[PDB]
């Protein structure tokens, strides 16, 4: 099991100026269209089996000022999913952010297991 | 050499309310951020060689409305783009559009050669 976020930072209620979402694999992917020209920093809490991602808890995206603008949590009702599902939820999100000229950096673990 | 687009279509000028344009290779994807939940159809005029694509002249995207909301055109300063470039511009455009809950359909010719 791995962690990039304070139990606080993962339990922090957050909201969007311009809500967007996309449901993939077993993964909900939300992200605020309002954000542009910022650095976004990706932090995932997740589990691992045999040196590889096993299950995602939450990935959240922070700005320089530590605000969260996008999350990638499992589906509430129907969460079962693989890790190949995750790499895509991320491509998806990252893709959306970079459309608004934001530049993206990812947690170290996030790059090891994805 | 293939043409989904009547000359009027590929020549006509067109506008956006929430413009956004990414770059990839020698190609310039612009899209109107202001469009939500519309069906978009991709028509592309392009040159083919053998049984695969050669040079995009342009790819525009239309609502059932006939209005063009996106365009993947070759950058004038450097004009050269690649086959793979085009594959990327398109994926990028789908993705950027599909965030606004838009549904896409591609011309036969596009699906055939890309």
Author numbering:
A (entry chain B), B (entry chain A): 89 to 202
Sentences from the paper on this structure:
The N-terminal 73 amino-acid residues of NS1 form a symmetrical homodimeric RNA-binding domain (RBD), which is connected to the central effector domain (ED; residues 86-204) via an inter-domain linker. Present models of the tertiary and quaternary structures of NS1 indicate that the protein possesses two globular domains, each capable of forming independent homodimeric interactions. Our bioinformatic analyses indicate that the N-terminal RBD forms a very stable homodimer, while the predominant and ubiquitous helix-helix contacts between C-terminal EDs bear many similarities with weak transient interfaces.
In contrast, several possible ED homodimer interfaces have been proposed based upon crystal structures obtained using NS1 proteins from various strains. Although the helix-helix dimer interface is shared by all structures of the NS1 ED, and may have some biological role in that RNA-binding activity of NS1 is affected by its disruption, we noted that in all helix-helix structures the arrangement of the two ED monomers differs markedly relative to one another. Previous studies using recombinant Alb/76 and Ud/72 EDs have shown that a single W187A amino-acid substitution is sufficient to prevent dimerization. However, at this same concentration we routinely observe complete dimerization of the PR8 and Alb/76 NS1 EDs.
